[PDB]
């Protein structure tokens, strides 16, 4: 009487909680752990979906909030849905549109009925209810659709956190009932609770009672402490079902990815690679190369001789160093292609080490290259790794 499972576990680390798996979605199989870039082209500065396809990306994020006349998710009235609008043959994960509404507008109010917004020019009100959030996602046809949740700042403390956690449970059940096409789209729940161990445990116990295809860990991209960050992640994965995906939203730093894979997470997203490129910085196994600095002026090697991305096939560090100072826009595009490929290659290398039963050794190699010697790893990541049985040498 159980719903079909979209995830297949290929290998599990004998020490940590690391998992190598496959997502079987309507638009093809996705290898996990997977970083998911933003396929939405709401930015002049970015990477096209055709280039994401060339990099091997088989699932990306896509949303329509940036379209239309008013803020909030928008219907596109396209025959082929958001896949046709994006020209994307692969998998799409679509947000609810609620986080962007309460975060960017800042004039929105959250009630039990949904997210409300009074127009700036005339005061016309747009209400984003769980019914309306799912009806839009059904029309977009995305492969994975996210629950509309009551998002609170992780730093904000008080009954508001508990209020949002219970409201997210009530909204989750509203999204389930309103969700047509469960044969084509997978609705994920979002675990709330902020930094409170008892609130998240209540949300974990309650939300896992629903038979949604996947579960997401929300409310942790905020500026909390790294100790509270990894503890809430480990708490979540310790009580989420192992036979279903775990989506940790908003984490993109290389060290945060390796640790949270070791904590049992399967899916990630973050605009960190794009923002890193705009500082003239390229992601490497040792951190990031600040290519604007003149040490690369006559450095004609690629960013990374091991990287397979087109930027490292065609352009050198010197060309990018000069391009950052003569055409900053074109250089941002080349670094964006690389930084996104580094994320893809990092996740692919993590998965290979889990399949080959050498994930703990992979983490030591990663920390040594990232921080000099694995013992120089940040204290918070040492605590998180040791809590699942990975010590650094
Ligand atoms: Br399914
Ligand atoms: Cl990205
Ligand atoms: Cl469902
Ligand atoms: Cl210098
Ligand atoms: Cl050159
Ligand atoms: Cl292993
Ligand atoms: K909009
Ligand atoms: Zn590259």
Residue numbers in the entry: 11 to 403
From the article:
In contrast to the homodimeric architecture of the bacterial and archeal TGT, the eukaryotic, heterodimeric TGT is composed of a catalytically active queuine tRNA-ribosyltransferase subunit 1 (QTRT1) and a catalytically inactive QTRT2 subunit. Here we report the first crystal structure of the human QTRT1, which is the catalytic subunit of a eukaryotic TGT enzyme. Analysis of the human QTRT1 catalytic subunit reveals the enzyme to possess a bended (α/β) barrel, consisting of an eight stranded β-barrel at the core and eight flanking helices. In addition, the protein contains a Zn2+ binding domain, in which the zinc ion is coordinated by a triangular arrangement of three cysteine residues Cys317, Cys319, and Cys322, while the α-helix bound His248 completes the tetragonal coordination of the metal ion.
Multiple diffraction images datasets of the best diffracting crystal were collected, processed with XDS and subsequently merged with a resolution cutoff at 2.45 Å. The space group was identified to be C2. The crystal’s asymmetric unit comprises two molecules with only one of them (chain A) exhibiting reasonable fit to electron density after initial refinement steps. However, structural analysis of the asymmetric unit’s content revealed both molecules to be the catalytic QTRT1 subunit. Comparison of the human QTRT1 structure with the previously reported structure of its bacterial counterpart from Z. mobilis reveals both proteins to share a fairly similar fold with a root-mean-square deviation (RMSD) of 2.86 Å (calculated between all equivalent Cα positions). Differences between both structures were observed in the conformation of the region comprising amino acids 114–138 which adopts a three stranded beta sheet with an extended loop between the β-strands two and three that folds into a more open conformation compared to the bacterial TGT. In the reported QTRT1 structure we observed conserved Asp105 and Asp279, occupying structurally equivalent positions, thus arguing for a conserved catalytic mechanism. As a consequence of the purification strategy, which included a high salt concentration, we did not observe additional electron density in the active site that may correspond to a bound ligand. Furthermore, we do observe a PGA molecule at the interface of the asymmetric units promoting contact of the B-chain with a symmetry mate through stacking between symmetry equivalent Arg184 residues. Therefore, our crystal structure supports previous observations that QTRT1 is mainly monomeric in solution, and the dimer architecture we observe in the asymmetric unit is likely caused by crystal packing.
